[PDB]
Coordinates of C-alpha atoms in Angstrom, one line a residue:
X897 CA 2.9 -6.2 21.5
X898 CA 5.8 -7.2 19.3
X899 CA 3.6 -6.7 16.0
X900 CA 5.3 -9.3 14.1
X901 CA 5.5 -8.0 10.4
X902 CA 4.5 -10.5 7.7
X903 CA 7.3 -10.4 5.0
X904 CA 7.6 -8.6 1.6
X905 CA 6.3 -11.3 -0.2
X906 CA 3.2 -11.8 1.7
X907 CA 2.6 -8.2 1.7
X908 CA 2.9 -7.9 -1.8
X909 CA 0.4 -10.7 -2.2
X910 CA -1.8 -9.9 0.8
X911 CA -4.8 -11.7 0.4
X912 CA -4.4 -12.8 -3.1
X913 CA -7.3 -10.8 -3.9
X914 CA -8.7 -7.1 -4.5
X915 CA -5.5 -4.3 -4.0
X916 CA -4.6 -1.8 -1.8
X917 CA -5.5 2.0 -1.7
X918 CA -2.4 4.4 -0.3
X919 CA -4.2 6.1 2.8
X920 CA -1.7 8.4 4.4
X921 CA 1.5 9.9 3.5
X922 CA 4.5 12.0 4.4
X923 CA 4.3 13.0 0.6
X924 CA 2.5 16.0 -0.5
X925 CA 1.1 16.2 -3.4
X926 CA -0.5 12.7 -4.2
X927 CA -2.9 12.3 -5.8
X928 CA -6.3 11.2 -4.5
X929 CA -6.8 7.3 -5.0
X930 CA -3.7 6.3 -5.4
X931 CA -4.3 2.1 -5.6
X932 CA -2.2 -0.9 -6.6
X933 CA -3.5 -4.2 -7.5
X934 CA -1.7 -7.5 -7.5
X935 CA -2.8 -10.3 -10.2
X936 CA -0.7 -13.3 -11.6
X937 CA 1.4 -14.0 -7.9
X938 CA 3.9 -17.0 -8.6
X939 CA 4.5 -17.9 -4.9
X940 CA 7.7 -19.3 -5.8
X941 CA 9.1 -16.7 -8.0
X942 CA 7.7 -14.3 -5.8
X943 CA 6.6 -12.1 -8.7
X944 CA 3.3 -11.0 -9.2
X945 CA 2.0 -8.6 -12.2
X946 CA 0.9 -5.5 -10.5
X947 CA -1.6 -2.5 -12.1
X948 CA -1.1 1.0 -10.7
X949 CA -2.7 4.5 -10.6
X950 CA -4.7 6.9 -9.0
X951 CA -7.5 9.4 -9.6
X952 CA -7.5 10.8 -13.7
X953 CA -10.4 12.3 -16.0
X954 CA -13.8 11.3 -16.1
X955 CA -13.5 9.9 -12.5
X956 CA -12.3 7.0 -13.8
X957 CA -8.7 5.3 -12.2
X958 CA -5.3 5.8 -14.1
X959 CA -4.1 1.7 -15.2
X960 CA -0.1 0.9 -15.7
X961 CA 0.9 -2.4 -15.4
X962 CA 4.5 -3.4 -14.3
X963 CA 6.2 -6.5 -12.8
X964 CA 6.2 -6.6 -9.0
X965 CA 9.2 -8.5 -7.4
X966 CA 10.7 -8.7 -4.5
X967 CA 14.7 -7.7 -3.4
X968 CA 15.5 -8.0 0.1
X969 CA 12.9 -6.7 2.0
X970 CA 11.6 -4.3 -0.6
X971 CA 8.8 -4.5 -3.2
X972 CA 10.6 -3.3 -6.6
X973 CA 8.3 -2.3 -9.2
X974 CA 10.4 -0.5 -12.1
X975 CA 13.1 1.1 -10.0
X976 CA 10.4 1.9 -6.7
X977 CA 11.9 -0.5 -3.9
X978 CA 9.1 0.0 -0.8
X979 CA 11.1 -1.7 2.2
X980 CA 7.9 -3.1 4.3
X981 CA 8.1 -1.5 8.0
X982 CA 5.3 -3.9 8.9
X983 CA 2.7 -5.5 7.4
X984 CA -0.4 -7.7 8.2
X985 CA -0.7 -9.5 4.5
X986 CA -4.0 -9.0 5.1
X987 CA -5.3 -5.6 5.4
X988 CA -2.4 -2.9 5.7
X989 CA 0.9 -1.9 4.8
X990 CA 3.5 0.3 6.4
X991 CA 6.4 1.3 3.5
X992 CA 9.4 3.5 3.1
X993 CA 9.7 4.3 -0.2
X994 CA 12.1 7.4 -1.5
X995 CA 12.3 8.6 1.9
X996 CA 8.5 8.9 2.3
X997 CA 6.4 6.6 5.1
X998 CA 3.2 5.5 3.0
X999 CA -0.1 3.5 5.0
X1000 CA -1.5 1.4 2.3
X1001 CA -4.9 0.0 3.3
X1002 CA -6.7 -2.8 1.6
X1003 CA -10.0 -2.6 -0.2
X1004 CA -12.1 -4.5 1.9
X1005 CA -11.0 -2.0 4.9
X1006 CA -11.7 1.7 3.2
X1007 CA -15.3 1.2 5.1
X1008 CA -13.5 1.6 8.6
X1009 CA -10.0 4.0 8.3
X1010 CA -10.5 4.5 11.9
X1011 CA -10.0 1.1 13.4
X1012 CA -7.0 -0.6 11.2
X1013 CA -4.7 -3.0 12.9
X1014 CA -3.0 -1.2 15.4
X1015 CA 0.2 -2.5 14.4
X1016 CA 0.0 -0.7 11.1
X1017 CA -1.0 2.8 12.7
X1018 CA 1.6 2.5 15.0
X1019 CA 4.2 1.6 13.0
X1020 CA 2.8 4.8 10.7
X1021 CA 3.0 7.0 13.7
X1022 CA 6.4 6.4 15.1
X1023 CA 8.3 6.4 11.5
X1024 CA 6.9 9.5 10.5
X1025 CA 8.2 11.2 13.4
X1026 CA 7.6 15.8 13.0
X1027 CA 6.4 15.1 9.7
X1028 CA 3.3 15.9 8.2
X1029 CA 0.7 13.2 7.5
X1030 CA -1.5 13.5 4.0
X1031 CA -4.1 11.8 3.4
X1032 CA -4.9 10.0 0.1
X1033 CA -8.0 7.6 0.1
X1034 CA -11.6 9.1 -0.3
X1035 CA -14.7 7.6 -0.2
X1036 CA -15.8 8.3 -2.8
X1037 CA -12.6 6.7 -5.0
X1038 CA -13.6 4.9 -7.7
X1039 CA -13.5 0.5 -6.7
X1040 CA -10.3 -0.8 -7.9
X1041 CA -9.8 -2.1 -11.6
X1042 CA -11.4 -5.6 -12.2

């Protein structure tokens, strides 16, 4: 019942392996397969490099890479700080980041979108109050780099 969020830190490094696909949003306009992928996670630094993208030409994922950190109870990467609303460290993410409520899903759980941890579609639910959800992830994104 009380959903007991993991922190930023072990939602940034979920697993330790594969990344996460964004799934729903308040955003419009995203586009399809948006993904980020942890690598190099220094558990006491609590940095991590992560790569980032979505969808581009020739079906083929977008790749930026950037330092992932964390401040607070925020993922920073660049000047992005994605304050975790809950989190399972394992297969989903609830974030608010630049106003916007994003449900980030992790690659071993695209198979089933319809029965994620009920803590993260909660939390998804109630933050996003009147607004319109989006969603993101397809099928038929390409796997993650790697």
């Amino acid at each position: 019942q009380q959903c007991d969020t993991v922190s930023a830190w072990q939602s940034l490094r979920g697993p330790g392996t594969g990344g996460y696909y964004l799934f729903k949003t308040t955003e419009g306009g995203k586009t399809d397969c948006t993904y980020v992928k942890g690598s190099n996670f220094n558990d006491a630094a609590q940095t991590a490099t992560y790569t980032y993208g979505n969808l581009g030409s020739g079906n083929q994922l977008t790749q930026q890479t950037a330092s992932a950190s964390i401040s607070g109870n925020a993922i920073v990467v660049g000047t992005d700080h994605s304050e975790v609303l809950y989190s399972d460290g394992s297969t989903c993410d609830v974030v608010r980041l630049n106003g916007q409520i994003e449900l980030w899903i992790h690659s071993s759980a695209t198979s089933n979108t319809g029965n994620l941890n009920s803590c993260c579609t909660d939390k998804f639910n109630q933050e996003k109050g009147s607004r319109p959800e989006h969603v993101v992830y397809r099928s038929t994104c390409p796997n993650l780099p790697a």
